[PDB]
Structure formats: C-alpha cells, structure tokens
Amino acid sequence: VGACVLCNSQTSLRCGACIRRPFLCCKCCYDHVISTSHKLVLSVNPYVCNAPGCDVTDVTQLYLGGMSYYCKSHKPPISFPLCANGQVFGLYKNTCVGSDNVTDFNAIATCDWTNAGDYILANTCTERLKLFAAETLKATEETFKLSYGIATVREVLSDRELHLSWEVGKPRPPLNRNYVFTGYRVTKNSKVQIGEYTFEKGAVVYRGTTTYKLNVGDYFVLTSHTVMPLSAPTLVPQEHYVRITGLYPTLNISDEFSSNVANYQKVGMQKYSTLQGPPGTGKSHFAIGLALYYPSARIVYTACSHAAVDALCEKALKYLPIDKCSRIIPAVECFDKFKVNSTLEQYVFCTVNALPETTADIVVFDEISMATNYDLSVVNARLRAKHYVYIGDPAQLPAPRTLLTKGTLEPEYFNSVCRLMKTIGPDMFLGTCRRCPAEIVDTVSALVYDNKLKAHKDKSAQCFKMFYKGVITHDVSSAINRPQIGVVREFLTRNPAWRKAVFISPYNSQNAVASKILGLPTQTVDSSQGSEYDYVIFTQTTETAHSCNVNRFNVAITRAKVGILCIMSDRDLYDKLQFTSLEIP
Numbered sequence: 001v002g003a004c005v006l007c008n009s010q011t012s013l014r015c016g017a018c019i020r021r022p023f024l025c026c027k028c029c030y031d032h033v034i035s036t037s038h039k040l041v042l043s044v045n046p047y048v049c050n051a052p053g054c055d056v057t058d059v060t061q062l063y064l065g066g067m068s069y070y071c072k073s074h075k076p077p078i079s080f081p082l083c084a085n086g087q088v089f090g091l092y093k094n095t096c097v098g099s100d101n102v103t104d105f106n107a108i109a110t111c112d113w114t115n116a117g118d119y120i121l122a123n124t125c126t127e128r129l130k131l132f133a134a135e136t137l138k139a140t141e142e143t144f145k146l147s148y149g150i151a152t153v154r155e156v157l158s159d160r161e162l163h164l165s166w167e168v169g170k171p172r173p174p175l176n177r178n179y180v181f182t183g184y185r186v187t188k189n190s191k192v193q194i195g196e197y198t199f200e201k202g203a204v205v206y207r208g209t210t211t212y213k214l215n216v217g218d219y220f221v222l223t224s225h226t227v228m229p230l231s232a233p234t235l236v237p238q239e240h241y242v243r244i245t246g247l248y249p250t251l252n253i254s255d256e257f258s259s260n261v262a263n264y265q266k267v268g269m270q271k272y273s274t275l276q277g278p279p280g281t282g283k284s285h286f287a288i289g290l291a292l293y294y295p296s297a298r299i300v301y302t303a304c305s306h307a308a309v310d311a312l313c314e315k316a317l318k319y320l321p322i323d324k325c326s327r328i329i330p331a332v333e334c335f336d337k338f339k340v341n342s343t344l345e346q347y348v349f350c351t352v353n354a355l356p357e358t359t360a361d362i363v364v365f366d367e368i369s370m371a372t373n374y375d376l377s378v379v380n381a382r383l384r385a386k387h388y389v390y391i392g393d394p395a396q397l398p399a400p401r402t403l404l405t406k407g408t409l410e411p412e413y414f415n416s417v418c419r420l421m422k423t424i425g426p427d428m429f430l431g432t433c434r435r436c437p438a439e440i441v442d443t444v445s446a447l448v449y450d451n452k453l454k455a456h457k458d459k460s461a462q463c464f465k466m467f468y469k470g471v472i473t474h475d476v477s478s479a480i481n482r483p484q485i486g487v488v489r490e491f492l493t494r495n496p497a498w499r500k501a502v503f504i505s506p507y508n509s510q511n512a513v514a515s516k517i518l519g520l521p522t523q524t525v526d527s528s529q530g531s532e533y534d535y536v537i538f539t540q541t542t543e544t545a546h547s548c549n550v551n552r553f554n555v556a557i558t559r560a561k562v563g564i565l566c567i568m569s570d571r572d573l574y575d576k577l578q579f580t581s582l583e584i585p
C-alpha cells in the first residue's frame with residue numbers, strides 16, 4: 001500500500017514495468033497501463049496468471065477468479081477482469097481522483113534519459129514528479145553502469161600502469177575521472193574491495209584510492225549503489241519574514257565579513273535563499289562568515305563532494321573554534337582535523353549522502369550547480385532547518401549526466417535551485433571577483449553574468465588568445481589536437497616564465513598528450529572547478545557542443561589569477577575573449 005505519485009490517492013498498486021515501481025491508484029494505474037507499454041502491475045501480490053506455466057503478466061488480459069489472478073484462457077467461470085471501467089482492480093477502489101493529463105508521468109516513466117527534453121520535463125513537472133523522475137533517472141544511471149564489461153588485470157607492466165582484459169559481449173566504459181571503478185581481489189569463495197580507482201589510455205594509467213601491489217586476476221567494476229525512494233521536496237515552501245527569525249546577530253563583526261552583513265540579514269528574513277558566487281567572489285568566506293554573524297546558530301554545512309565539504313572545513317579551520325566543529329564520514333581520505341561523526345556538534349560538515357537526520361539553525365548547501373534534484377530532496381529529508389542557504393553559480397558546471405547525448409542541458413534545468421536563480425534571479429550576488437585579471441572578469445561578466453561581475457584586480461596584460469583549428473584526432477571517447485599542443489610548446493620556448501602554468505583542456509586525452517610533450521600539470525575544466533592557478537594554458541581542442549559550452553568556458557578561463565593563453569577552435573568564443581590576440585608562427 002502507498003500513495004499514487006499523481007493523485008496521492010491511497011492505493012495498493014505499483015507499476016511492475018516502472019523501474020522504481022511507483023504506487024499508482026486504480027485511476028492513475030489504468031490511465032498509465034492503457035497509454036503505455038507498461039502492463040505489469042503489482043499489489044500485495046503481482047497481477048500475474050496464478051495458473052501453472054502461463055506467462056500472462058499484462059493486466060489488460062487478467063481476471064480475479066476466487067482470490068487468485070488468471071488470464072482469459074485459465075480463468076474460472078466466476079471472475080471479473082483486473083483492468084476495466086478506467087480503473088485497475090485493487091484496495092481503496094472508491095478513493096481515487098485521477099488527472100486531466102498523465103502525459104508527463106508516462107514520459108518520465110518511459111524515457112531512456114538520452115535526450116535533453118527528459119531532464120527539462122524532470123525540472124518543469126509537478127514536485128511529486130520531480131522526485132519520481134530523480135529516482136527513475138538515478139536508478140536508470142546505476143543500472144546502465146552494470147551493462148559495462150568487467151575490466152580484469154592481465155599483466156602489471158609497472159607501478160601506476162596496467163594491462164586490462166575486458167568481459168566479452170558487453171561495451172567498455174570511457175576511461176576518464178567521470179568513471180570511478182572499484183577493484184576486487186579473488187578469494188576462496190567470494191571477493192573483497194581493494195579501494196576505488198580511475199583509468200586513462202596508457203596498457204592503462206590508473207590513479208587509485210589507496211596504494212597496493214595489485215596483481216593479475218584483480219578486477220574492476222563501476223560500483224553502483226541502491227537508490228532510496230525520495231519523500232522530501234527539492235525546495236521547502238518559501239517564506240519571507242519581516243524581522244530576522246530564530247537567529248541572534250553579533251553586535252561586533254570584523255571588516256572581513258562586513259560586506260556580507262546585509263546578505264546575512266536577508267538569510268534570516270526568509271526560509272531559504274539563493275547566493276550566486278562567480279569565480280573567486282568569496283562563497284566559502286560568505287558561508288563561514290555567516291557563523292560569526294550568527295554565533296549561537298547551529299550550522300550544518302553540506303555539499304555533494306567530499307572536496308567541497310573539505311574546502312568549507314579548510315575555511316572553517318581559520319575562523320571557527322575547532323572544538324565546536326565535526327566532520328561526518330561514513331564507515332576516500334577527507335579532512336581529518338575535527339572530531340569525526342559528532343552530530344550534536346555546533347558546526348557540522350558532511351556530504352549530502354552521509355547526512356544524519358537532524359535539525360539545525362542554518363543549513364549551508366555549497367557548489368549548488370553540481371546538485372541534482374535527488375540531492376536537494378535528501379537534504380530536505382535529513383535536515384529540518386529554520387534557514388536554508390544554497391550557495392553556488394548556475395554559470396559553472398553541473399553534475400555530469402552520463403546518459404545524456406541529444407541536446408544540451410541549460411543551467412535553468414540543472415536543479416530546482418538553479419531553475420530559480422535563472423528564472424527569478426538569485427536572492428544574493430557576490431559581484432566582485434578577487435582572483436582573475438580584469439580581461440578575464442570583463443569577458444565572463446559579459447559572457448554569463450549580465451555585466452554585473454566587477455574586477456577587484458587590474459588588467460594583467462598577461463591574457464592572450466590565438467585562433468588555431470589545427471588537426472583533430474579521435475580515440476575511443478576523447479579528442480586530441482596535437483598542433484594546438486604544438487603551438488603551446490612553441491609559445492613556451494618564447495615565454496619560458498609560462499612553464500609554471502597549469503594545462504587545461506576539455507578532454508583528458510588532450511591532457512595526456514600535453515603532459516608528455518609540455519610536462520605542465522594538467523586538469524580537465526571539470527577537474528579544475530574550484531581551483532585557482534597563477535597561469536593557465538587552455539587549448540579548446542575541438543568546436544564541439546562540449547568544448548563550446550559557455551559554462552565550461554566560464555570555469556576554464558576563471559582559473560587564472562595572473563595570466564592565461566587560450567588556443568581557440570571556435571570563432572564565437574574567440575571573438576568573445578577580451579584578450580590580446582596573437583598571430584600563428
């Protein structure tokens with residue numbers, strides 16, 4: 001028994017072809033089964049033919065005869081169908097509303113999640129359907145990881161480099177840091193974990209969670225995790241207050257957090273508040289500063305990534321009493337300077353999926369562009385708070401959608417929070433970039449921030465751009481542009497001070513080639529997010545949807561504190577770079 005996800009109607013049915021098996025009421029179950037290929041139905045039992053060796057599962061060909069279900073062929077003389085009068089048969093057969101359209105829920109139930117439209121619907125549908133869609137998606141994502149062939153260690157060529165043997169009659173996943181493996185050692189009568197791993201074309205380079213002497217027969221699978229059902233909405237119902245509520249502001253603050261006093265008050269005068277923090281505008285500074293402005297306030301800081309929760313801890317470590325902080329960790333090496341897994345501690349720092357059920361004065365969720373509606377619901381499910389602050393930047397990178405291939409995913413469709421920030425704007429905006437040279441700030445202010453992002457620093461006169469298409473080669477799942485790396489090699493010989501630069505590209509393969517030919521440290525734009533470097537060398541590599549995504553370009557060029565060389569493929573972003581142009585040697 002449960003709740004129709006369209007009617008909320010109390011029902012004893014679930015769609016057996018829907019991977020999540022939503023509860024559907026008589027009405028909605030019918031309206032679902034007669035309008036889609038979804039025809040298995042589950043009650044306190046499965047609507048299947050209890051006759052011996054008949055495969056009839058379809059609910060539109062089944063009859064309740066006695067207290068056992070049967071198809072046309074097997075049914076007893078006295079039987080009624082299971083599926084007639086616009087209602088499939090089950091408990092609570094009287095209480096059952098329906099819907100003017102079931103269209104959206106059918107699409108969510110039956111889409112494969114390859115098309116943009118699927119993610120758009122999941123972010124414009126009713127809130128109950130936002131939850132259903134978020135589960136359906138995450139479970140579809142986790143199942144697709146199983147369709148991947150097992151990789152097995154054939155040969156250990158070196159230390160940090162392997163030969164992989166791959167399960168036949170299955171595809172192999174891409175080898176970039178968006179595919180994280182778990183290893184396993186072969187045992188008597190089962191297997192045990194040996195850490196998480198990542199791979200890259202070599203033979204294969206492997207970067208593992210722990211160190212080992214892993215030997216032949218050790219094998220690797222993308223570990224999938226059981227997706228829980230979602231209860232809580234992605235956003236609580238909003239409220240606006242006329243005073244600050246349940247928070248007691250400090251009387252003496254420091255001139256370090258004084259630019260945020262207005263904003264911290266706003267946080268106290270509404271139930272939740274959206275903060276857009278462009279690159280190096282001070283999001284974490286803002287987030288810790290909030291504590292000092294409400295010193296009695298209990299504050300759970302949360303984010304999707306260990307990395308993001310840890311950067312909050314690093315900042316906390318410099319301003320908040322250590323004894324009054326705790327890092328929640330489930331039984332990967334994360335921040336270890338606060339008492340571990342102490343929930344009743346004033347300042348709790350914890351990833352979303354490891355959050356305890358607990359209350360707080362304020363909840364600070366960071367790097368929000370990386371949150372899915374799934375994570376939103378979980379936070380609301382685990383944390384009841386007087387005040388929720390969602391810090392992030394919808395002009396930065398979302399969570400990867402591995403299944404997505406047809407269309408691009410717009411920032412207004414990353415999650416419920418980013419939808420709000422792109423449609424009604426954010427509650428607050430950190431408008432001054434402390435990190436980048438003026439040229440980079442000017443460029444992205446115009447590009448993605450409506451010309452409201454101002455440069456704290458001057459022009460560096462150290463930002464350059466070159467238009468060089470060069471030559472694009474493709475390996476299995478990545479791009480390489482050797483002539484763009486050539487141009488960078490030639491620039492470095494003439495500009496040797498740039499040897500302190502990081503190499504960023506939108507492809508880990510370009511990165512690998514660059515590493516061998518330049519010996520610059522490398523990041524993918526995605527791997528670079530929330531990191532700063534004095535000098536950055538960016539090769540666009542291709543003119544793809546991927547390499548020209550304005551949010552990826554935004555993150556790419558905002559990693560520089562002092563100077564940047566962009567070797568560009570795309571005439572459009574090339575022309576949008578307010579940088580000194582360079583001719584080709």
Ligand SMILES: [Zn+2]
Nearest residue numbers: 004007025028
């Ligand atoms: Zn219903």
Ligand SMILES: [Zn+2]
Nearest residue numbers: 015017018038
């Ligand atoms: Zn279904």
Ligand SMILES: [Zn+2]
Nearest residue numbers: 049054071074
């Ligand atoms: Zn039968």
